[PDB]
Symmetry: C3
Subunit: 400 residues, 3 copies
């Protein structure tokens, strides 16, 4: 009966698109949107406990072989599927030509060392990192905690074996409880989906016209091809049924699509991975990493929009400019956060790499138009972002 | 032997009232007051762990019937006992006439959407909400966690039943430990009560004179009538012996009276509810909620002081304005936090409701005079605030 | 094979001292130093969980006798060994005369009630204190929690005994797991030691010359005499073989020396105390306390530098001023935090005690010179600070 999410999604996208066409976006923002916001509030509630607990228990696996190999593989999957998404976005923005009318405007006025990021992946107080919603530091600590718990259960002493067993059970009992709540809040998901889709359709409905229609088309048709030409093809190569994969991932896909936060849909994403029969050692490490590392819809978006500005500015991006886009957009997609709208902010990075700084007021003009339709683009962008998460999660799972 | 709190309270209110009448409030603030502050520090120490643990364990009950019915009942009790307390304060401030001398002054210069409060009751990181002292968000998460733990203990699998039992046991052992510390710090309570009663008596002793004596009298007599005509009567109606109820609640009453923080006296309040034989499913959820939601002494205070200001300005508050006072003071008593002094700040809200803004310097004169005696009033105010918590807690407990 | 820390330390101090003598301190700060920083990041990661868990489990001991006696003894040991370290620094700074050349400079421009510290040792939300890295408040709460758990295990009811045993096991399983991680990160310690020692050798290598060489010499020779004439002698008096004690504490000593943070080396310090056969009731409470309370190398440093400044200004510190130096530097060493550089900051306190404020630009000249060589001093300073922790920890352990 949970397929009523589509019922809540489809006709919900209509009632908002109607009211917004009569100056009722304020009525949606005052009555309808709070319900969909509450849905996101409930989803964010479960992220930190379900990620920490499942990954401590998920570290009940061969630490050198399993964790090391699933890591060094999924990072190569993530890097390859993101480098292919930005090239596909380039190809889309090359077949298409979103920037046609050179529209100048005035008053745009837009706008972290690597060692300072890597050294912060290792926390200095996991109680704070858990209390501050830092997923990568708590992934690191929970990996080390579960491995230490496993080493405790293999000693000759029974007291330390009994204590480690008592700790790991309570942590698993927490994880199981968090998954049951995921099912509970996913039962309310059709209402929250209906509300969040009435908004962003009553607000950013009529805006998408002209050259904005081309860039939205170029992204979405490239996003579907990313699902088909990459995920579907690579799933069949490793012998994973694509139709059944999508039939299960409908929940996490649409939840990411409507919420636009890959970190907010991670509880649903983790539960779907449990539903398809994936080892906890796999999805509890692969998915929270890919939530902030694997952004395929972002790199495609970023590769399309980076042509739209230059195409609307007359700038001719040579093959070298396209390759620097491919490289820089991958790096920007890694840094892009699992929160709604972040990809538009880090899109500046690839714009700077091609000698198109946001300082130029003419560049800031087109940038303001993209942020005016980001809500639409971000929905499908996050969906493919999480779809690639579950794809490589299942691929590396069935690789072991 | 713990009744020496009264011994520490009574003669402690004298030694401060004596020393304060000879310019020794600095000696109390430098030597005596730190002991009562440490008492509050120990009480605040236990609030977050004892509330989270006891309510997770308290969620080992029929979730639809028990929790739903105890909720929809205690919220109506809270709304009715607060709406009666503000009317009783109005009746007191009408029998009395605190504002007689129109005293003008110079240099007063005094001085959250509902959806932003309701949507904030649902946390987004329970690790942080526990680390930030947010009782309403941790109440919500602990309800859902215990229900999920109960649903885990009813599955056919033994592993998830063992893990859920392991988790719920450690949480209960934490709650039990917190209650034992409550008894330990309650043994030191007579000293902290003696110290906190030397202060506010050495500081705010002779201050209460004239119109200040009238408004303080009208408040306390309404608070006693609220205790007698409401709590005692409704206790007897539901077959609860009032005298034995007071014999149980003596600890939480004097602690709330002395501490003035309903959230700081909540550990003592929770222990008293256990001692009088209440199930955790009832009191462990009702009390922390009512600590911040149910404030009857606040609504009575606010209903009395809002008359004193208008009476000291000559403005005639019509019967319609008196009804808006009843409504707004209830809302302000709901929003008032369980920390000392919040009710005087939330009095501004009902003052705005009657067209008496704090911007007007004549309004700021009487407002600053009320804040100059708030300490004394706040003591009895918090006492009735927690008394109404324990009253309805026992009523709805014996209703099941 | 872990003795390769010395291999990483010794020749590591050379490769930095070489590269730093050719303008390659930036190459060390950009490539070498991040490795030693990561080592400190991993060490800080374990401090809060291993201290809370081990001390809750360590509270499984006779609370009045054991904890009370180990406390009232180790606080007297700490006060005596710190009062002797500052006198030894005075004797060193009197045998030596670091301040010889009165060097005036321009542009120095340098630069908490006791009740507010004591009352802050008692937390008001242990979830926050754990999430904020506050070791003294979590020490207090963990003492009270473990004692309450012990009182729970001695009741006639079996349910509360089972829950308390379930809680204490999971906490012990956490402590054991943290100790296993301490061994894991201590295996990486030789690399982090090699990186942190190449730094402050490439940075502060040639700097120590002249009066800087004299004050640094006076500090270290007093630190060694503090180790020999105090620790070694008092160990032998209480029947502890000094050579075997060093063979155990070699890890914590070199880690403290290299990290300069007594709180960052506390996990290694706690593990060494376990390896040398100390009950958790003693060391797990004594060590985290002494980490921030017992700093003998700090008081010696402060006693030496306070002479160097006055000697570089010509002011004659009388015997009475020398006694106030002893007292205030002990207080400054008590208040000094377990983070690198705090002792130089707390040196201002004893400088104010002798009428030598940092406001005087001539005082700020010598002060800036001491802060220009504080890094090396701090290395040996922290080493003796933690050495005195483990010394008295073992003494009071074998006293029970
Ligand atoms: N919505 C994306 C971020 C973005 O595309 O800006 C995510 O949460 O992963
Ligand atoms: N002292 C009250 C608040 C107030 O009266 O301002 C309470 O904590 O409930
Ligand atoms: N490094 C010392 C502080 C100092 O000497 O400044 C410590 O952490 O204990
Ligand atoms: Na993602
Ligand atoms: Na990303
Ligand atoms: Na309130
Ligand atoms: Na209350
Ligand atoms: Na100190
Ligand atoms: Na120390």
């Amino acid at each position: 009966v949970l397929q009523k999410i589509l019922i809540g999604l489809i006709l919900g996208a209509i009632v908002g698109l109607i009211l917004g066409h009569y100056g009722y976006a304020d009525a949606v923002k005052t009555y309808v949107k709070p319900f969909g916001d509450l849905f996101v509030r409930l989803l964010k509630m479960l992220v930190m406990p379900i990620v920490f607990a499942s990954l401590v228990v998920g570290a009940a696996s061969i630490s050198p072989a399993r964790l090391g190999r699933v890591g060094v593989k999924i990072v190569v999957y993530y890097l390859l599927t993101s480098a292919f998404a930005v090239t596909l976005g380039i190809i889309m923005a090359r077949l298409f030509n979103p920037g046609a009318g050179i529209h100048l405007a005035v008053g745009g006025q837009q706008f972290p060392p690597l060692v300072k990021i890597l050294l912060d992946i290792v926390p200095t107080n996991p109680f704070g990192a858990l209390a501050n919603g830092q997923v990568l530091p708590t992934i690191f600590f929970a990996i080390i905690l579960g491995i230490a718990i496993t080493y405790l259960m293999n000693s000759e002493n029974e007291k330390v074996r009994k204590s480690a067993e008592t700790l790991l059970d309570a942590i698993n009992g927490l994880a199981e409880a968090m998954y049951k709540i995921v099912n509970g809040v996913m039962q309310y998901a059709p209402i929250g989906v209906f509300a969040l889709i009435a908004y962003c359709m009553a607000e950013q409905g009529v805006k998408v016209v002209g050259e904005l229609a081309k860039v939205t088309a170029a992204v979405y048709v490239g996003l579907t091809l990313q699902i088909l030409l990459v995920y579907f093809v690579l799933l069949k190569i490793y012998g994973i049924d694509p139709i059944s994969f999508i039939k299960k991932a409908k929940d996490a896909m649409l939840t990411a699509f409507v919420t636009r936060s890959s970190s907010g849909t991670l509880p649903v994403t983790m539960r779907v991975a449990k539903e398809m029969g994936i080892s906890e050692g796999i999805y509890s490490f692969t998915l929270p990493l890919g939530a902030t590392i694997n952004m395929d819809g972002t790199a495609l978006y970023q590769g399309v929009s980076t042509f739209f500005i230059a195409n609307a500015l007359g700038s001719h991006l040579t093959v070298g400019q396209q390759l620097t886009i491919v490289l820089t957009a991958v790096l920007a997609s890694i840094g892009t956060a699992g929160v709604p709208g972040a990809g538009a902010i880090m899109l500046a990075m690839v714009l700077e790499s091609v000698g198109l700084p946001l300082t130029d007021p003419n560049v800031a003009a087109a940038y303001a138009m993209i942020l005016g339709i980001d809500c639409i683009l971000d929905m499908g962008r996050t969906m493919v972002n999480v779809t690639g998460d579950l794809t490589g999660t299942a691929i590396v799972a069935k690789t072991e």
